[PDB]
Subunit: 280 residues, 2 copies
């Protein structure tokens, strides 16, 4: 692995802010500002994917994620014709289990300081409208974030964004959800990422946790600034993000690649431990 | 040393088109896109200098650069109060001599491909209007670039920049030229960096090569979006770069730091070899 060499200046402030506000929290000894990315993905950081390495959003294409082995371009980014963009990102979670992933995705979302463990440089804020769900009885791990919305403030590039991420049952997009078990997929986190104000789509997002001998691998896909949720129409009266005068789908896709690899490789360093300490 | 983990999308295009066009030059074998920064400056990539670590442009301040040992914050960046920026950077050149540096600063400037050697991802073009100066007999190395103007197209961040660098004798800014020999300074590359059209000031630029026992060390200073050339009056009719909407002096200073460290650490990997091969 190799240490990150670029830290946008607003994020140099935020990481210090986060380090301080978390001082007394019990999980605070998980706060490590050190971030890195594995040697194996460096080619993906230096050149875009070719068009034929891009996965589509039809159920045919999506369900290709359930095949054993790997697809073309497991990790990379590129611009798309619309002015939209695409990111794929594989991240390994050795010595962790998909249940830890499931656990993690609701656990982090109720305290901002918890969120800042995940990316100490970029995560500023997170809240839900349903605090109750943290403690309610007889819910599985999935039931505590699937269906929910996370209102998030974070940096995915130079500037802070206010985004709303709603998680969905993958079957809603035509995923062969029943086939998840046999394909060794044991956790998922899929949904739409909208801008807080205009509700423009920043990303259709997929996270699939597939079991490996050492733990599990995360296979993630983002279709950036696309026109619609898969298997749905565009929302009437909401413009595509590609219409925003300065916006670049290609560059956003690159930032998403860098962000995703930084975020999830970091999580993978302390997920099995924070689970053992704060989970069931 | 650590490899660069961040490559703006336009530079990923430029490095490929740079590799293509150099293919068949006699110095093509020096083209290597692997870039890296030393462990010792990571601190400086993660947080800004405080203002008491910023050197001024008064001849009294500039001349501190001649003092034995180091100043505070030899390597770093920060915003300045008036929207301006500041970059300082130290880069080590083991097995190199200041004379190779004097040689390099003219030799590279006469073909765009030579320039691309220096930073394969960011250098797109260079031209000078005095091609005879390359082959005029009996000129010192310094006479081949001091007073000359290099018209440059390059990335210092996300977007190409068309700039013009005009190199000056350091005396012209109040530098105790007499003192250079005894301070171990055997080469210099100082000048004003102006924007192609507007002639707005992008940087006041100082590069000093001080002899070390392993070769030389390069000590660099940039005052970004400053108001005038040292020891001179602001040109009437030119706005300060800080007046352009969107310009962050602070952000530009950070880009300049990443850019200096990449560039000159890269130059250091091959300068002794290409001097031996293409110099005197
Ligand atoms: Mg995120
Ligand atoms: Mg340069």
């Amino acid at each position: 692995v190799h240490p990150i060499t670029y830290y946008p200046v607003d994020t140099q402030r935020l990481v210090r802010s986060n380090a301080e506000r978390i001082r007394h929290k019990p999980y605070a000894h998980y706060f490590n500002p050190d971030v890195a990315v594995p040697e194996e993905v460096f080619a993906a950081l230096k050149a875009p994917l070719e068009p034929e390495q891009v996965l589509g959003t039809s159920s045919t294409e999506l369900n290709r994620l359930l095949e054993p082995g790997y697809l073309e371009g497991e990790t990379g980014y590129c611009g798309l014709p619309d002015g939209a963009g695409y990111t794929s990102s594989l991240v390994r979670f050795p010595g962790a289990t998909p249940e830890m992933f499931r656990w993690w995705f609701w656990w982090h979302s109720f305290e901002p300081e918890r969120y800042s463990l995940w990316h100490p440089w970029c995560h500023a804020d997170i809240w839900r409208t349903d605090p109750e769900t943290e403690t309610a009885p007889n819910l599985t791990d999935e039931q505590r974030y699937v269906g929910s919305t996370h209102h998030i403030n974070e940096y995915i590039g130079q500037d802070p964004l206010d985004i709303e991420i709603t998680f969905i049952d993958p079957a809603r997009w035509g995923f062969d959800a029943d086939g998840f078990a046999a394909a060794g997929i044991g956790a998922h986190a899929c949904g739409s990422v909208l801008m807080k104000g205009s509700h423009m789509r920043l990303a259709t997002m997929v996270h699939l946790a597939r079991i490996t001998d050492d733990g599990f691998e995360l296979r993630s896909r983002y279709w950036i600034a696309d026109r619609a949720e898969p298997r749905h129409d565009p929302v009437a009266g909401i413009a595509q993000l590609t219409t925003v005068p300065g916006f670049s789908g290609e560059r956003q896709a690159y930032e998403q690649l860098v962000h995703d690899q930084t975020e999830f490789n970091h999580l993978a360093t302390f997920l099995p431990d924070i689970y053992q300490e704060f989970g069931p």
